[PDB]
Amino acid sequence: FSKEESREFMAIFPDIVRDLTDAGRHTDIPEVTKRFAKVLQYNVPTGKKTRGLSTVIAYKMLEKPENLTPENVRLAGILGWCVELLQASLLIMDDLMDRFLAINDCLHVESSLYSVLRKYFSHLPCYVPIIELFHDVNFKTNMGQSLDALCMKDGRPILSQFTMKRYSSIVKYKTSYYTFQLPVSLGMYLADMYDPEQHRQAKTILMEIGEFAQIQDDFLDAFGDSKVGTDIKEGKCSWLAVVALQRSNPAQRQIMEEHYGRPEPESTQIIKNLYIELGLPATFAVYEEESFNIIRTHIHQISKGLPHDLFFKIMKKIYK
Amino acid sequence: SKEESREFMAIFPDIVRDLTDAHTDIPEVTKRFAKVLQYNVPTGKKTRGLSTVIAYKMLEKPENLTPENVRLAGILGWCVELLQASLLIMDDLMDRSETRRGQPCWYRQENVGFLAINDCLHVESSLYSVLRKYFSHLPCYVPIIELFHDVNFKTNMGQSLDALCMKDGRPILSQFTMKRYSSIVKYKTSYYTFQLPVSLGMYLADMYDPEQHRQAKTILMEIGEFAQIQDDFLDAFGDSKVGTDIKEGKCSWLAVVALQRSNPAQRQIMEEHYGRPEPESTQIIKNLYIELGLPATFAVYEEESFNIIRTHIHQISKGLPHDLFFKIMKKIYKR
Ligand SMILES: CC(C)=CCC/C(C)=C/COP(=O)(O)OP(=O)(O)O
Ligand SMILES: [Mg+2]
Ligand SMILES: [Mg+2]
Ligand SMILES: [Mg+2]
Ligand SMILES: [Mn+2]
Numbered sequence: 001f002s003k004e005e006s007r008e009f010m011a012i013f014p015d016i017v018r019d020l021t022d023a024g025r026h027t028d029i030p031e032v033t034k035r036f037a038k039v040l041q042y043n044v045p046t047g048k049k050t051r052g053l054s055t056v057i058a059y060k061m062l063e064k065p066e067n068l069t070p071e072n073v074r075l076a077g078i079l080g081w082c083v084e085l086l087q088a089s090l091l092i093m094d095d096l097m098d099r100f101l102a103i104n105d106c107l108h109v110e111s112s113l114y115s116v117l118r119k120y121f122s123h124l125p126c127y128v129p130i131i132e133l134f135h136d137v138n139f140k141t142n143m144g145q146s147l148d149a150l151c152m153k154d155g156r157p158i159l160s161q162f163t164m165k166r167y168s169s170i171v172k173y174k175t176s177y178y179t180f181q182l183p184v185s186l187g188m189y190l191a192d193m194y195d196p197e198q199h200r201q202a203k204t205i206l207m208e209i210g211e212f213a214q215i216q217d218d219f220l221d222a223f224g225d226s227k228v229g230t231d232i233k234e235g236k237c238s239w240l241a242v243v244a245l246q247r248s249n250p251a252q253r254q255i256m257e258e259h260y261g262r263p264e265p266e267s268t269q270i271i272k273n274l275y276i277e278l279g280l281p282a283t284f285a286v287y288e289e290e291s292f293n294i295i296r297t298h299i300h301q302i303s304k305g306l307p308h309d310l311f312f313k314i315m316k317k318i319y320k
Numbered sequence: 321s322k323e324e325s326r327e328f329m330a331i332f333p334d335i336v337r338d339l340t341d342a343h344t345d346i347p348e349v350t351k352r353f354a355k356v357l358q359y360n361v362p363t364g365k366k367t368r369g370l371s372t373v374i375a376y377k378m379l380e381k382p383e384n385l386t387p388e389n390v391r392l393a394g395i396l397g398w399c400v401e402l403l404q405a406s407l408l409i410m411d412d413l414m415d416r417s418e419t420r421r422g423q424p425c426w427y428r429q430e431n432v433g434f435l436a437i438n439d440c441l442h443v444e445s446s447l448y449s450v451l452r453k454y455f456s457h458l459p460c461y462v463p464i465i466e467l468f469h470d471v472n473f474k475t476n477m478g479q480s481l482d483a484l485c486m487k488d489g490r491p492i493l494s495q496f497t498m499k500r501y502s503s504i505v506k507y508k509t510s511y512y513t514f515q516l517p518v519s520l521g522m523y524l525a526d527m528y529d530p531e532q533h534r535q536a537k538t539i540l541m542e543i544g545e546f547a548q549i550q551d552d553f554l555d556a557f558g559d560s561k562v563g564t565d566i567k568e569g570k571c572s573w574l575a576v577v578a579l580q581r582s583n584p585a586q587r588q589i590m591e592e593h594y595g596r597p598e599p600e601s602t603q604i605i606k607n608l609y610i611e612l613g614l615p616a617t618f619a620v621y622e623e624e625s626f627n628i629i630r631t632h633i634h635q636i637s638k639g640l641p642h643d644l645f646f647k648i649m650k651k652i653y654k655r
Pocket of ligand 5: 482
């Protein structure tokens with residue numbers, strides 16, 4: 001992202017906080033409104049805002065050059081901040097259901113994005129498609145979180161649940177819809193692109209990129225140079241665990257049953273040793289090359305009047 | 321009414337099918353979501369959902385009250401019940417409560433716990449899918465979506481304000497003012513319980529005049545304040561649900577008025593014993609409420625508030641049926 005794109009995007013955030021904390025309204029509840037400003041300030045605008053900035057970039061690469069006014073690019077930035085409010089609610093729910101934050105802050109922050117949408121977009125033709133997209137993405141993300149939870153019982157991973165079909169569904173519902181589809185579909189709607197066939201062609205490619213993104217992340221959790229990866233300790237339905245179970249003989253499966261999802265550092269090393277024995281690094285290398293080629297082909301084939309350069313830019317960001 | 325109750329209850333199974341059986345790649349999680357809805361949504365009194373139907377029936381032109389429109393009002397009532405179910409799932413986890421409507425709290429069910437947070441957000445998100453299915457073609461669609469999102473935001477402000485009356489699980493009695501109490505009740509309870517059903521009835525009746533919505537709101541916030549004060553009173557003075565407001569350190573009307581009326585010695589009993597787990601501390605607080613004459617104070621408030629609200633309803637500007645607001649008063653005051 002350019003300095004100009006980043007600075008213009010960041011310039012919106014203080015307005016969003018003022019909008020949501022009723023600045024100029026003279027509220028009857030100033031204590032809790034001031035607290036909510038801190039919830040937003042402490043949790044929403046920090047670090048990389050990749051999903052929010054991707055919303056702006058998607059809009060800039062989908063819209064007609066003539067319509068790329070400072071006003072329309074600022075609307076794209078506001079949609080980007082609504083994606084970041086959703087991201088912040090999800091990260092808050094993560095901080096809560098593993099560990100100042102109150103349990104209802106995740107609900108509150110999620111609800112706040114709809115107030116921002118009403119303020120800035122309610123008079124535009126894209127309003128209803130955009131709110132329905134956020135509604136649908138919220139519901140599907142919750143389904144993905146529940147499907148992930150159905151892989152654990154009484155603090156132990158259920159290895160019979162670790163199928164590639166279930167893994168692919170968790171990644172799609174829990175992560176890819178809100179991370180990859182939502183920014184691009186928002187850019188399309190702000191560009192007055194409503195055609196279901198266009199959204200569908202974008203979705204096919206974005207779910208493929210999202211699957212590689214999570215598989216790469218799962219690979220690096222164990223095999224990256226260090227955050228220090230805890231997927232094995234936490235019993236996560238990781239791509240590595242799924243493929244290990246596909247590749248295991250009965251003796252190797254017994255090692256997974258005994259040592260996967262255990263707190264002891266030695267058990268994490270036993271699983272890493274089994275992943276090495278099973279050739280998961282070589283399997284990832286083959287998958288990275290094969291998935292790159294398939295996705296590149298699908299982007300070359302993209303039709304329905306969609307630009308290729310947006311999808312190539314997304315693919316190159318993930319694959320480097 | 322038997323007919324109203326049965327017609328309303330008949331809609332629930334269709335809504336569960338709409339939300340779980342219309343994602344064919346993930347049947348395990350749709351089957352689980354059906355159980356989340358079946359446990360948390362349809363077993364209560366459904367006062368708020370039924371009140372949405374009654375509000376609509378009293379706001380709509382009699383000649384437009386078709387079975388089809390009454391069913392739409394019922395679907396909106398179930399969306400209110402979905403919102404409430406999400407809120408109580410979350411509140412029960414936050415308050416670590418044992419039971420709700422005489423069932424174990426959802427978060428206490430095997431392998432839920434903090435996953436109740438995801439179930440809360442899921443149940444709330446689900447009502448917008450119901451709205452899209454049945455209302456997307458109607459002029460009331462966007463006002464209704466916006467009302468649900470705004471009431472969710474305001475209810476969260478109420479829940480967070482309630483939490484600013486506690487520090488590390490101990491009540492902050494300096495926070496227990498009638499001003500803060502009134503604000504908690506308005507935002508945490510009255511908006512979703514009283515404003516939302518009536519405003520939904522108004523929108524389905526194509527009544528969009530913000531001033532009609534404002535006048536309804538003034539009366540409904542007054543009725544909602546009495547409703548919560550009565551509930552607080554009965555938590556301590558009701559005849560056996562066994563009330564635990566004292567043990568929980570709740571910012572109750574009884575605690576607020578006790579602090580107004582207390583001499584320094586009585587204040588110290590509140591400081592020492594309010595929000596403690598020991599049964600004898602609850603007894604000490606109840607005994608202080610008796611010493612301070614809170615029963616007589618409630619009896620006077622019940623009489624005066626009834627008369628003041630009846631006066632305000634008589635003054636409601638034409639367009640709104642006084643009968644609707646009197647019917648709500650009669651439900652709450654039982655007269
Ligand atoms: C944003 C959220 C989660 C709002 C909760 C709304 C609500 C009605 C809580 C119950 O209040 P309470 O805990 O004072 O009373 P009860 O005794 O009914 O739990
Ligand atoms: Mg990871
Ligand atoms: Mg509670
Ligand atoms: Mg009560
Ligand atoms: Mn509570």
